[PDB]
């Protein structure tokens, strides 16, 4: 038995639904309460258990409101998720890495007993949009004990992520003009080691802001990635490997993963 396994046997329909099967509550993190980040919202399963924990960063000028849907949706599949605000709207990717790190430490050590009691502090992941996705790659490089990293339409001036050993799913948007896949997402994917678990999923007919709107493909693949890498949930490998065919423009991976 896998002691980390949560929730029912998955299907495409259950993964593409707006909500998973776990009822969710929220805990506000004020700016005053937050050390090292701008505050945010913690989404957690009402059902008492331990779960993996995830921190998600927005991009430049963005706030937690732009990633709230994704925090709620992932939490509804059996994760504790914080959507952060940054200290300023100007903060760059390497700063968003530090703030993601501070948000994970907050959930583990400084949140209510309600939140702390629901976290397995040994099973952590990070995600983010645009510069938040650049932050995701930077923190993954600094914190190899993270179980997963999911950069969404990521932006970073550093193109070389050969130091990352955290299982990483990069989601690019084909029509992105702010973090074009040719200069950001693909170079990031290509520089990650060939020897790690990784994938690149490019959305078809998608702009840079696809991750800011509820999106069944982002929701399905983010949850499947977190289930396999954070929970060792073998029921989810079927969605990742071989993974989706040519609303997916392309899918590259180091499948098989199991």
Curated annotation (Swiss-Prot):
- Broadest EC class assigned to this enzyme: hydrolase
Quaternary state and interactors: Monomer.
Presence of the UniProt keyword Amino-acid biosynthesis in the record: no
Q: Which reaction does it catalyse?
A: pentanoate ester + H2O = pentanoate + an aliphatic alcohol + H(+); an octanoate ester + H2O = an aliphatic alcohol + octanoate + H(+); decanoate ester + H2O = decanoate + an aliphatic alcohol + H(+); a dodecanoate ester + H2O = an aliphatic alcohol + dodecanoate + H(+)
pH dependence, per the record? Optimum pH is 8. Optimum pH is 6.0-6.5. Optimum pH is 7.5.
Which Cys-Cys disulphide bridges does the record give? 241-255
Cellular component GO terms, alphabetical: extracellular region; periplasmic space
Please state the gene responsible for encoding this protein. cut2
Instruction: Describe how its activity is regulated.
Output: Activated by magnesium ions. Activated by calcium ions. Inhibited by the serine hydrolase inhibitor phenylmethanesulfonyl fluoride (PMSF).
Places the protein is found: Secreted; Periplasm
The record lists the organism as: Thermobifida fusca
Q: What is this protein called?
A: Cutinase cut2
Q: Which terms are listed as keywords in the entry?
A: Disulfide bond, Hydrolase, Periplasm, Secreted, Serine esterase, Signal
Tell me one GO molecular function of this protein. Answer: cutinase activity
**Signal is among the record's keywords:** yes
Q: What is the applied biotechnology use of this protein, as the UniProt note states?
A: Has potential for application in biological recycling of plastic waste products. Shows promising applications in the laundry industry as a cleansing agent, as it is thermostable and tolerant to surfactants and organic solvents. Also shows promising applications in ethyl alcohol distillery processes as it may be utilized for treatment of molasses wastewater.
Residues the entry annotates as binding poly(ethylene terephthalate): 60, 131, 155
Temperature impact on function:
Optimum temperature is 25-50 degrees Celsius. Optimum temperature is 55 degrees Celsius. Optimum temperature is 60 degrees Celsius. Optimum temperature is 65 degrees Celsius.
Annotated active site residues, numbered on this chain, are 130 (nucleophile), 176 (charge relay system), 208 (charge relay system)
Enzyme Commission (EC) number: 3.1.1.74, 3.1.1.101
Q: Which InterPro entries match?
A: AB_hydrolase_fold, FrsA_esterase, PET_hydrolase/cutinase-like
Family, according to the entry, reads as follows:
Belongs to the AB hydrolase superfamily.
Pfam short name (any one): PETase
Q: Do you know which Gene3D superfamilies this protein is assigned to? A: alpha/beta hydrolase
Q: What does this protein do?
A: Catalyzes the hydrolysis of cutin, a polyester that forms the structure of plant cuticle. Shows esterase activity towards p-nitrophenol-linked aliphatic esters (pNP-aliphatic esters). Also hydrolyzes the triglycerides triacetin, tributyrin, tricaprin, and trilaurin, with a preference for short-chain substrates. Hydrolyzes the hemicellulose xylan. Capable of degrading the plastic poly(ethylene terephthalate) (PET), the most abundant polyester plastic in the world. Can also depolymerize poly(epsilon-caprolactone) (PCL), a synthetic aliphatic biodegradable polyester.
């Amino acid at each position: 038995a896998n002691p980390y396994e949560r929730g029912p046997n998955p299907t495409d329909a259950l993964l593409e639904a707006r909500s998973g099967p776990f009822s969710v509550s929220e805990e506000n993190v004020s700016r005053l309460s937050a050390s090292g980040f701008g505050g945010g919202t913690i989404y957690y399963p009402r059902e008492s258990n331990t779960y993996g924990a995830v921190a998600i960063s927005p991009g430049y000028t963005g706030t937690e409101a732009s990633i709230a849907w994704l925090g709620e949706r992932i939490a509804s599949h059996g994760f504790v998720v914080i959507t952060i605000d940054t200290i300023t709207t100007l903060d760059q990717p390497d700063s968003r890495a530090e703030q993601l790190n501070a948000a994970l430490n907050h959930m583990i050590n400084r949140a209510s007993s309600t939140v702390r009691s629901r976290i397995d502090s040994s099973r952590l992941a990070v995600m983010g949009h645009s510069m938040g996705g650049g932050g995701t790659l930077r923190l993954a490089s600094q914190r190899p004990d993270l179980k997963a990293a999911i950069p969404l339409t990521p932006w970073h001036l550093n193109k070389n992520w050969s130091s990352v050993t955290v299982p990483t799913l990069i989601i690019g948007a084909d029509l992105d003009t702010i973090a074009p896949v040719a200069t950001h997402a693909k170079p990031f994917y290509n520089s990650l080691p060939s020897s790690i678990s990784k994938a690149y999923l490019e959305l078809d007919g998608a702009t840079h802001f696809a991750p800011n709107i509820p999106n069944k493909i982002i929701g399905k693949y983010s949850v499947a990635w977190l289930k396999w890498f954070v929970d060792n949930d073998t029921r989810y490998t079927q969605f990742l490997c071989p993974g989706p065919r040519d609303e997916v423009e392309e899918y590259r991976s180091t499948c098989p993963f199991l």
